[PDB]
Paper text:
Pectin methylesterases (PMEs, EC 3.1.1.11 and CE8) are important enzymes influencing the digestibility of plant cell wall material by cleaving the methoxylated groups attached to pectin and releasing methanol that are then used by methylotrophic methanogens in the rumen. Here, we present the crystal structures of PMEs belonging to the carbohydrate esterase family 8 (CE8) from Butyrivibrio proteoclasticus and Butyrivibrio fibrisolvens, determined to a resolution of 2.30 Å. These enzymes, like other PMEs, are right-handed β-helical proteins with a well-defined catalytic site and reaction mechanisms previously defined in insect, plant, and other bacterial pectin methylesterases. The catalytic triad, consisting of an arginine and two aspartic acid residues, is strictly conserved in our Pme8A and PmeC2 structures and the structural equivalent PMEs discovered via Dali analysis.
The monoclinic crystals of Pme8A revealed continuous electron density of the main chain in only one of the three monomers, with the exclusion being the L2 loop (residues 204–214), which forms immediately adjacent to the presumed pectin or substrate binding site of the enzyme (monomer A; residues 4–341 excluding residues 207–213, monomer B; residues 5–341 and monomer C; residues 4–341 excluding residues 208–213). Similar to other published PmeA structures, Pme8A is a right-handed parallel β-helical structure of eight complete coils formed by a set of three β-strands. This structure is maintained in part by an internal core of hydrophobic amino acids and some, particularly phenylalanine, are placed at equivalent positions or stacked on neighbouring coils. For Pme8A, these include Ile36, Phe56, Val99, Phe129, Tyr172, Phe192, Phe235, and Phe265. The N-terminal domain is formed by a single β-strand and α-helix (α1; residues 5–32), which also runs parallel with the β-strands coils, while the C-terminal terminates in a single α-helix (α2; residues 321–341). Extending from the β-strands in several instances are solvent exposed loops that connect them to labelled L1 (146–167), which forms the largest loop at the base of the presumed active site of the enzyme and L2 (204–214), formed in part by two alpha helical half turns immediately adjacent to L1. In the Apo form, the Pme8A active site cleft measures approximately 27.5 Å (L1-L2) long, 18 Å wide, and 7 Å deep when measured along these structural elements.
Author numbering: 4 to 206, 214 to 341
The structure:
Amino acid sequence: KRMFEVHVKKENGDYSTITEAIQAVPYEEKAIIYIGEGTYHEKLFCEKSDITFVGAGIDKTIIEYDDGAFDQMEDGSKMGTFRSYTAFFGGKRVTVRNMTIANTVGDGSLHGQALAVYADANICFFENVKMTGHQDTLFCAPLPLTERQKNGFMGPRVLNPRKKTAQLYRNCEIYGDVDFIFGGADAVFEDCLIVCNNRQKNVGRFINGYITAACGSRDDLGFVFRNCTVRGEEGCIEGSVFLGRPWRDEARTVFLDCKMDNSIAPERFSGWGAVDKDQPDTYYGEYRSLDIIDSSVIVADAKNAFVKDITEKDYKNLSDRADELKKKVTE
């Protein structure tokens, strides 16, 4: 079996840091980095043709860093969203399994956006990975076409083309509050636990968060959640957590056969900048959402009018498309 292998351990490894292991890997070589138990306080930048990272399991291998968008850089500039990442995964194919990746800086009101993971590779596959943060925990590239704020995309891909990506998340746990899964990827989340933090404790109607903030094209797949558990953290007030708001106007995000509780807002999805702002070019929706406790069917007839009614035909389409992205990624 030919594969370039590197073993990271706190003691007796090839290296004691992940960064040094990444350096070791030649871009063009199919590689795997095994990472032993421990907490690795590092900011990772990985760009490779075909690499796999395998930790010792969720909360056994932990990659953590604490950069926030509001931080000041040496040159005087604000770090910004897209430089806050604990880990950047770019290149052609990346696989990550059996670890926690955390941005520990804190709530966005004091520290700004703070990515745990910047997922930029053409094809990304996360399995049994836990990702924690507050604002903007997980970015699934690509960026929108153009910025609305000066230097809004400052980061490693600001100059680059907006490459479409295909991402698969299986058995992951993802924690955050405001826009904590966002970007323009075609991304399927399967059998994931997705939890909005109780922002109200970390700081009219109080809004704890927006699970998604997609910005893809109306002709692409966008975010598909299937058989996931989606909810606020224990303590979140009723109806204070949205399934999404559209970061750009053709946002696509669907939840198929998911379990949810009553922390989820009655409107289900928000407009951008105000709850009841119309977003007629989004494809936002739920199909067969079940209550988490008793598996009884959820009915929301107070959803925003722009939220779609997923017919059985729409559902088979979304399922087939999610299925073909899964094949592309795992094939």
